[PDB]
Amino acid sequence: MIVLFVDFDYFYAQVEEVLNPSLKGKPVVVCVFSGRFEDSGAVATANYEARKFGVKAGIPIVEAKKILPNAVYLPMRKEVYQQVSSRIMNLLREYSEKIEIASIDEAYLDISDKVRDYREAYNLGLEIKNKILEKEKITVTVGISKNKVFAKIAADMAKPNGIKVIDDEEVKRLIRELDIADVPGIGNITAEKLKKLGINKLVDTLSIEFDKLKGMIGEAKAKYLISLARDEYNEPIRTRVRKSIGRIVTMKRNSRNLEEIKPYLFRAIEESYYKLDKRIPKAIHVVAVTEDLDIVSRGRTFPHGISKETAYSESVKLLQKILEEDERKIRRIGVRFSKFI
DNA sequence: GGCACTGATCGGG
DNA sequence: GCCTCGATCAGTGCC
Numbered sequence: 001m002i003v004l005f006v007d008f009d010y011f012y013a014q015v016e017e018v019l020n021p022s023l024k025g026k027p028v029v030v031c032v033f034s035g036r037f038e039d040s041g042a043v044a045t046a047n048y049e050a051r052k053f054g055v056k057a058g059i060p061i062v063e064a065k066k067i068l069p070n071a072v073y074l075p076m077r078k079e080v081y082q083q084v085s086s087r088i089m090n091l092l093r094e095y096s097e098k099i100e101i102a103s104i105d106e107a108y109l110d111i112s113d114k115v116r117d118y119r120e121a122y123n124l125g126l127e128i129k130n131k132i133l134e135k136e137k138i139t140v141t142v143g144i145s146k147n148k149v150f151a152k153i154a155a156d157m158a159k160p161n162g163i164k165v166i167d168d169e170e171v172k173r174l175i176r177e178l179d180i181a182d183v184p185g186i187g188n189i190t191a192e193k194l195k196k197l198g199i200n201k202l203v204d205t206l207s208i209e210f211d212k213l214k215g216m217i218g219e220a221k222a223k224y225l226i227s228l229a230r231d232e233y234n235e236p237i238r239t240r241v242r243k244s245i246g247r248i249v250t251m252k253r254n255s256r257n258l259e260e261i262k263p264y265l266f267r268a269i270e271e272s273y274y275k276l277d278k279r280i281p282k283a284i285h286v287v288a289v290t291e292d293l294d295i296v297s298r299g300r301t302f303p304h305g306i307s308k309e310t311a312y313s314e315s316v317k318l319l320q321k322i323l324e325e326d327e328r329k330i331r332r333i334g335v336r337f338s339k340f341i
Numbered sequence: 342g343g344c345a346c347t348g349a350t351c352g353g354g
Numbered sequence: 355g356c357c358t359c360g361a362t363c364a365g366t367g368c369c
């Protein structure tokens with residue numbers, strides 16, 4: 001088919017600029033402050049003026065300040081970005097009945113029934129860009145190609161404030177030339193399991209015999225890569241259904257005292273029910289992040305919905321199970337809810 | 342043998 | 355750091 005992928009530019013930082021245009025041209029850094037002490041936490045994202053100098057998503061706020069001590073550091077206002085995002089997604093709904101909202105700032109549209117060729121798709125992407133800038137003053141990047149994967153690769157290639165088509169010949173080109181590490185779904189861990197098999201371009205997956213592949217990276221990832229390499233990857237645009245909702249907070253200090261952990265757990269439950277809104281979950285998981293940043297979790301499913309009160313008692317029992325079965329101290333604690341009615 | 346669960350892992354935003 | 359974060363894996367109960 002023809003797939004049009006849309007990815008909002010430096011999204012959180014850009015929303016802050018739209019709400020305060022005085023920020024334009026200055027380096028802006030959106031931060032997630034944990035609360036342990038002044039400037040503990042991580043950068044969620046930064047605009048290009050800050051990113052130019054190495055201030056990127058994930059780094060410690062303290063490291064960012066080392067690099068650009070005079071930048072504007074703003075606390076993440078996720079609920080604001082979520083509202084702006086919801087409005088832009090509503091705009092995209094008008095350009096295709098088949099839309100897949102992939103995350104807070106990305107969506108795929110199947111525009112097969114809306115255009116005959118790539119020339120026409122390109123024009124449709126420009127139209128969408130202009131509509132989003134018109135209504136919300138947000139810039140975005142558009143990628144277009146024959147499937148979801150190469151559409152995303154296109155947008156990657158053209159950001160910021162871009163638009164690009166990857167046509168059939170170029171798809172055949174990329175299967176040959178593009179490094180596997182640049183293929184969506186290959187991370188550091190799988191990339192280096194591939195290097196260690198010698199695989200470094202997509203075409204190579206087709207000459208290695210399946211089980212050396214499957215054996216090392218898994219059945220699913222092997223099939224995925226092979227289908228891309230055969231130019232046979234087809235995955236429809238499907239509406240996404242939220243499968244879980246939760247909240248995990250950082251404690252003021254590592255601990256494995258139940259009475260000390262409890263107040264953070266109950267706050268996580270409270271904030272989680274607020275986010276659930278009308279969704280009633282049948283499953284609850286307590287989730288612990290250990291001092292060495294590992295993640296442990298224990299859950300229970302009920303043949304019925306979980307009332308806040310049942311969430312409160314069950315969560316303590318689940319936290320207790322985690323304390324027995326793992327002796328590392330806990331750094332972050334929260335819950336996730338799922339299996340909605 | 343293979344389906345339905347579970348917690349851990351991996352890739353990603 | 356936190357997720358309006360989900361998919362897939364190995365280990366297992368089960369038919």
Ligand SMILES: Nc1ccn([C@H]2C[C@H](O)[C@@H](COP(=O)(O)OP(=O)(O)OP(=O)(O)O)O2)c(=O)n1
Nearest residue numbers: 008009010011012013044045046057058105354
């Ligand atoms: N480790 C990360 C990565 C991303 N985000 C959030 C903030 C980003 O703005 C948003 C979108 O991700 P991109 O990965 O799309 O980030 P920008 O949109 O920030 O980057 P770009 O303009 O390159 O797309 O998700 C986050 O909180 N933590």
Ligand SMILES: [Ca+2]
Nearest residue numbers: 007008105106
């Ligand atoms: Ca994105």
Ligand SMILES: [Ca+2]
Nearest residue numbers: 007008009010
């Ligand atoms: Ca983006």
Ligand SMILES: [Ca+2]
Nearest residue numbers: 181182183186
């Ligand atoms: Ca990559």
